[PDB]
Ligand binder design. Structure first.
Ligand SMILES: Cc1ncc(C[n+]2c([C@H](O)CCCC(=O)O)sc(CCOP(=O)(O)OP(=O)(O)O)c2C)c(N)n1
Ligand SMILES: Cc1ncc(C[n+]2c([C@H](O)CCCC(=O)O)sc(CCOP(=O)(O)OP(=O)(O)O)c2C)c(N)n1
Ligand SMILES: [Ca+2]
Ligand SMILES: [Ca+2]
Ligand SMILES: [Mg+2]
Ligand SMILES: [Mg+2]
Lengths: 852, 845
């Protein structure tokens, strides 16, 4: 009504654009949604109060600033950000006049759209019947990624690490990372050399590459990497993060680094349907600001072609944008029109600037379209006739941008034509040279087992064990240890000097000795600092102040004061399995010289990371030549705590095992666990280790080891009873042999002692995979009067080691294992019964059968 | 002049950021939480005409007291306005009777926990102490649902106060919870292998204390795997809504079945399935009309601080992805908690959208009742030890307000304590049963079932593909599918894709509800299904099988065809379909993977629900998993449905596992599954290239006069001029490799070799297999042949079980397969072809 009323209506209008302007922005190059674009006129020329300091601006000028910033080809979502300094930063860079690119920069963008579109048309011409998951309709991704990388080089960063799905993957490999065209062309020809034909392999749009990006207008260079992935969309997201964090830790940058540059940048590409539908996206975003996982912000690019094969976005998500999940971490989101390559390159540079300023994730939603079917052989008008009727009228971004550069007089029609002829002439020359190569004979894929051959002294000095023991009592000045934590630290110093070392200390003796030798040790998982079973105490919390103390971190310094090079990185993970296991797998790939251990609360929850186990951990070497030394610690054992607190599903890991891809163990003694970890960290082999770890056996007084087992011994794949190797036991009295693995040994041994059964022997198989054939055959030959052999296990008949051992043992060793029978629980649907009482009755039946 | 503009920006600051200043944490852990207009402006009237003092007092009460409101992220302005109007007004104080009722809820909640502490000090119970307000809050949710006249509230929750909720909300007898702690279960409770006490469910009828309405209250079973039950709950509710003719597939838009989903703060932010389930909230094939979420935010995850649990301010920030309003409420204010719970139900009823309540509280004891939390959280537990619980604090406010006396409050606790002791003593007095090992559930559900249909039924389903609406324009490449199907229905040579629709269509015609979903399932990954056809000119949809829901005389059959394109999820989508089948046991529920290689994204559902739910909880599901499978040279992720993993999981006849080789056999497998009366999941390994194999077709008689065949012989012996006595080598197989072996046998005229197919992989068809092999008396060698690597396919289980169940028939059985491999296959189609030819050469060499 009045001046005070009018000025208040302007402030509401200013906030509506900043909050909701993106809903009116011309971001969709297809204009599919018809209803998208659903105070007096005398007040437009009046001057209003604006806090920008405070200045007086005409309503028309305020309005035009808001429309240009928020309602053109860029939809900006940032008012959900809780940090006011971040809202101010974006608001200042978005609500100002943007400097137009130079003619040279515009021409360079055009060259990126030329290379992008002519690569996809050349492939449509030469290999019309092969899938390539074309980037056609989304060519703007290439100048956009180029701008991200160029802006990272402009900030003087060290590396950009990419992860992406199928969409434009080959295009990115060739035009961004620098994968030779000849290599891509040789893949389509299906003529691979012995190096490319190694292992079982994988499809062309799953492969990675490395290279050096050189600035076109600047004087800096930056490393560009692209990591391998399975078909399983978004599964590589935590793997990328782990890989980057491992690289950042090595360059002394980021969270565990001297500077706060986070000089290794994750550039993560996504499809619009997969970004909203896959849970691992939220799991990986949730890691973005965590101390144990932060990479200083990820640059996310969503190639939003408004389709998921035949599925419309309406059936893909319950939200306006495919990127709305990124709001959970307060990430700014830029929705940009794919037909405006200049707006796309500008948003990409703004994204990198935001990441560098706040060490936080940024999401770019590139609205585009998919010119062809889902694959190049699919007909999309069957399911999307309206969308494909609009695409057929649509001139590509390259043709449109070419017509803009000719209009602006920047280039001629001849220069534009000649540049396309040059590019297609170059591809034809390389395609012909590749086709001219002599064709190799196709042979069946071969096992990778022999690609990595085992050398190994894992025994340490008594002074080493004592130093790790002393570290547990080398408390900072005035530190107050919790009264129930103090006996663990004192009992460990006692263990290190007097023996009877339990499982929990043997683990820290292994990790501590590696740190002392200069190894980087990364240990993480749910409540891993203290330990689920209050056993580890890798970090101790001051009772009065809350201050933390990490005893093994003292092993990173030599007694002469110099560093060993080693480090202890121990964290409490978020409540995730998929992202946490993926991250640790990626971390080991990123730093092959690191000791990387991930611990499940109980092995029963590792099935939440099944895609990582199946697609990365068990098969990555055979498929991509990608090596990982990740350790999975899986608390396992029948103790009456129910079907979810019992099994790490040993049978599933043994089923997945082939070609010596992983080591699978279930050690029964602390010393054997110690040597297993040291062998894994020192063998020079990069292969995952699956360890089935104890729960109650952690506090079993029989399950302790002598100092000489650490100082003058090595890993034992097969273990005999101490009464035969160190005692006065007679092996020739044995008629029944019991073959087992894990904690059930101690129960069988206690029953043997109670009944003085000299006729029965118990042999433990510590290394489940690869089977210790030679050592097992030698061991059995030491018992010549054996008339019957039984595989004994607490696990149901369809679980544990029996499904694989019952088939493999009589086949690999027919002389020793023909007639081998099973003693176990019945086959069960669940890993165990829900009642502790019923567990006890079943457990006693097993030992009665084994001795009856 | 500028003042009125600062007032509007200030109003906006409270609505936008006021929740960051709200006194929501009952522990006040964060010390720094509470950090253009004059004091003269407070009495002046401003444009929103209201005085500044009244404007600020309304903004403080609504946004900065015990309730933190997040709603300005909501894109629908009418939803922001709805919240605004209900939050920025004077709230009517509860009556003395209502306050007393809230106190009775906190009394029951806290005394149940202190009683279990006293009697069973050494047993885990994941106590609700420090979070007791959850009970009056859930009561308010359920009471508000009854006030809206809804039919049922279905709950899913984790361990935190599960026992308490069961006893004080659902109405599970105290005697039953006490018998569980005693460890003395009757034959009915000791059935199957079972599960732990805080995994079990219950059902009951809630009766309003002050109203005249009643509502059903259910609590569903779940594993330890936190949040895994979230999509299962949604599926269960959607199946119930579809039965009540409410919701998306109902005549009314009431969605009268309400999901009430409880969460722990660390699991809500860390588990991806949360985002996957939220993503389903407004989808046509999955919407339940909004879920009421209650996060029991005790600001701890066992020993893990929230700083290591999430990268955001609140544990509930993932719910912003679907524009859900979030209410952060102080757990020490049970009245604010009950009021927010009723507001939540009112928002769900108005907008058919999810609402999230973040109940800020604390965990009085350790993670479990035996854990010492001061080892890792000494500051937090030093603050908890000074804190008086919510029950004692609310009691003191009620004696202060003059509402109750100290005697009435004391006497009410003595009454509750006396009642619990009386029930505990009666339970302890019961005769103790002998503990025996758990038994297989195989015999709990016992199966000659006629699955054949009349030819007039095949013809009707064929005609339905051509019974197009007036003026409908079929895509030129879709029209031959429709016409070839009407030809197939009358002339035979029925392919796989049509045999599927013949099965689903005949069930619909018989009155069955059919739900089919998965990624690109309406058209089909291999462009073969066309369950829905899209008008080339208008985009309008036509579903041919939906015509089978009406009889020729115009009356309905009772059947329905619900076919959807799922979101790009496996975990949530498989969980949802499992829960749908549990919710409606009379429905035919099929979920289809794009390729079986992606079902490992739903591994927790397969492991924790599908394969073991019957043995653990007595929870039955008839869910069908369709898994496209087969070695064709498309790489390690487009080849295997990991058959070896499903066979490994199989035990106690929990599931049926099949790999049919013919359309007719697939048809009868689906019809047997839908008509057998048994509620057990069906795992089907389905074809890709075999869909278009001209040898893989069936006759009309195979549908009208035959039945499911667990084992199949070559047609040359059953219908041709082949001599079984000439056979010396027998090849045992399953799936598409049969046709390749059969083509090699014909090419070489190998009468000495026979190929026998095992269609039903689990349970193994012992009798038929032995009866079939007995027809080949001159067999000198038997081989299990498979295209899958040695450590994959059926060999790992069959190589061990076949010589054991049939020693006379299978002793000396050898394997013909690919070598053991880390990946399900090679990446090169050329290398695949070389390996495939080696198998064929070995089998015939
Ligand atoms: C977990 C999981 N569940 C299912 C699939 C099957 N699936 C995909 C392919 O099979 C892999 C493609 C090629 C390969 O790598 O082998 S793509 C697709 C459409 C995705 O669309 P979007 O909108 O995200 O991307 P676009 O529009 O396509 O750019 C679906 C459903 C999968 N790969 N992973
Ligand atoms: C996927 C998955 N990964 C790990 C676990 C192990 N885990 C849990 C238990 O084992 C389940 C409890 C016992 C049982 O049901 O058997 S609770 C927990 C802490 C919960 O934090 P929160 O803040 O969310 O809950 P509260 O504060 O406690 O109310 C973790 C880590 C799991 N069950 N599921
Ligand atoms: Ca190694
Ligand atoms: Ca059934
Ligand atoms: Mg897409
Ligand atoms: Mg918690």
């Amino acid at each position: 009504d009045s001046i005070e009323d009018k000025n208040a209506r302007v402030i509401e209008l200013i906030a509506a654009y900043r909050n909701r302007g993106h809903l009116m922005a011309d971001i969709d190059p297809l204009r599919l949604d018809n209803t998208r674009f659903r105070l007096t006129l005398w007040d437009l020329d009046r001057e209003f109060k604006v806090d920008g300091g405070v200045q007086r601006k005409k309503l028309r000028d305020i309005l035009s600033v808001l429309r240009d910033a928020y309602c053109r080809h860029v939809g900006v979502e940032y008012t959900h950000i809780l940090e006011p300094e971040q809202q101010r930063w974006i608001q200042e860079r978005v609500e100002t006049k943007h400097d137009k690119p130079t003619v040279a920069e515009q021409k360079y963008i055009l060259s990126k759209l030329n290379a992008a579109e002519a690569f996809e048309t050349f492939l449509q011409t030469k290999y019309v019947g092969q899938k390539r998951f074309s980037l056609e309709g989304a060519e703007t991704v290439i100048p956009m990624m180029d701008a991200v990388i160029d802006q990272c080089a402009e900030h003087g960063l060290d590396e950009v690490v990419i992860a992406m799905p199928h969409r434009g993957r080959l295009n990115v490999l060739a035009n961004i990372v620098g994968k030779p065209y000849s290599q891509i062309f040789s893949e389509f020809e299906g003529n691979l050399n012995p190096s490319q034909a190694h292992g079982s392999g994988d499809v062309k749009y799953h492969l990675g590459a490395t290279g050096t990006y050189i600035q076109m207008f600047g004087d800096n260079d930056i490393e560009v990497s692209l990591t391998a992935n399975p078909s399983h969309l978004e599964a590589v997201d935590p793997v990328l993060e782990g890989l980057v964090r491992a690289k950042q830790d090595l360059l002394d940058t980021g969270e565990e680094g001297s500077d706060n540059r986070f000089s290794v940048v994750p550039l993560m590409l996504h499809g619009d349907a997969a970004f909203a539908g896959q849970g691992v996206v939220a799991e990986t975003l949730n890691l973005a600001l965590l101390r144990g996982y932060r990479t200083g912000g990820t640059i996310h690019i969503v190639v939003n072609n408004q389709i998921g094969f035949t599925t419309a976005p309406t059936d893909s998500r319950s939200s306006e944008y495919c990127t709305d999940v990124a709001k959970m971490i307060g990430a700014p989101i830029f929705h940009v029109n794919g037909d405006d390559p200049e707006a796309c390159a500008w948003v990409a540079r703004l994204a990198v600037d935001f990441r560098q300023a706040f060490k936080k994730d940024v999401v770019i939603d590139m609205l585009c379209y998919r010119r062809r079917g889902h694959n190049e052989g699919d007909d999309p008008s069957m399911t999307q006739p309206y969308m494909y009727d609009v695409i057929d009228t649509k001139r590509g971004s390259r043709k449109a941008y070419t017509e803009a550069l000719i209009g602006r007089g920047d280039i001629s029609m001849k220069e534009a034509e000649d540049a396309l002829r040059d590019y297609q002439g170059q591809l034809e020359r390389v395609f012909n040279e590749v086709r001219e190569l002599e064709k190799h004979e196709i042979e069946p894929s071969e096992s990778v087992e022999a690609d990595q051959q085992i050398p190994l002294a894992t025994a340490v000095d008594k002074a080493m064990l004592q130093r790790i023991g002393d570290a547990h009592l080398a408390l900072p000045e005035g530190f107050t240890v919790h009264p129930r934590v103090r006996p663990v630290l004192e009992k460990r110093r006692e263990m290190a000097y007097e023996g009877r070392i339990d499982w929990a200390f043997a683990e820290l003796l292994a990790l501590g000795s590696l740190i002392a030798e200069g190894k980087l040790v990364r240990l993480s998982g749910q409540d891993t600092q203290r330990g689920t079973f209050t056993q580890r105490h890798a970090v101790i919390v001051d009772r009065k102040t809350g201050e933390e103390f990490t005893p093994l971190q003292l092993l990173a310094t030599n007694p002469d004061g110099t560093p060993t090079g080693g480090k202890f990185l121990v964290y409490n993970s978020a409540l995730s399995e998929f992202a946490a296991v993926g991250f640790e797998y990626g971390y080991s790939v990123g730093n092959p010289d690191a000791m990387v251990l991930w611990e499940a609360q109980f092995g029963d929850f590792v099935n939440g990371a099944q895609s990582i186990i199946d697609e990365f951990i068990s098969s990555g070497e055979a498929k991509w030549g990608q090596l990982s030394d990740v350790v999975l610690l899986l608390p396992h054992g029948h103790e009456g705590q129910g079907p979810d607190h019992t099994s790490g599903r040993i049978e599933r890991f043994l089923q997945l095992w082939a070609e010596g891809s992983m080591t699978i163990a279930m050690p029964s003694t602390p010393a054997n666990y110690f040597h297993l970890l040291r062998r894994h960290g020192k063998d020079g082999i990069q292969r995952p280790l699956i360890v089935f770890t104890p729960k109650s056996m952690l506090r079993n007084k029989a399950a302790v080891s002598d100092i000489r087992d650490f100082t003058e011994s090595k890993f034992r794949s097969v273990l005999e009873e101490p009464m035969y190797t160190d005692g006065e036991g007679d092996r020739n009295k044995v008629t029944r042999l019991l073959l087992t693995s894990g904690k059930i040994y101690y129960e069988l041994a206690a029953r043997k002692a109670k009944e003085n059964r000299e006729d029965v022997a118990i042999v433990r198989i510590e290394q489940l995979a690869p089977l210790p054939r030679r050592r097992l055959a030698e061991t059995l030959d030491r018992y010549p009067n054996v008339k019957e052999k039984f595989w004994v296990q607490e696990e149901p008949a369809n679980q544990g080691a029996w499904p694989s051992f019952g088939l493999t043992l009589p086949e690999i060793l027919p002389d020793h294992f023909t007639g081998l029978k099973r003693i176990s629980r019945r086959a069960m649907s669940a890993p165990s019964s829900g009642s502790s009482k019923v567990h006890a009755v079943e457990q006693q039946e097993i030992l009665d059968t084994a001795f009856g």
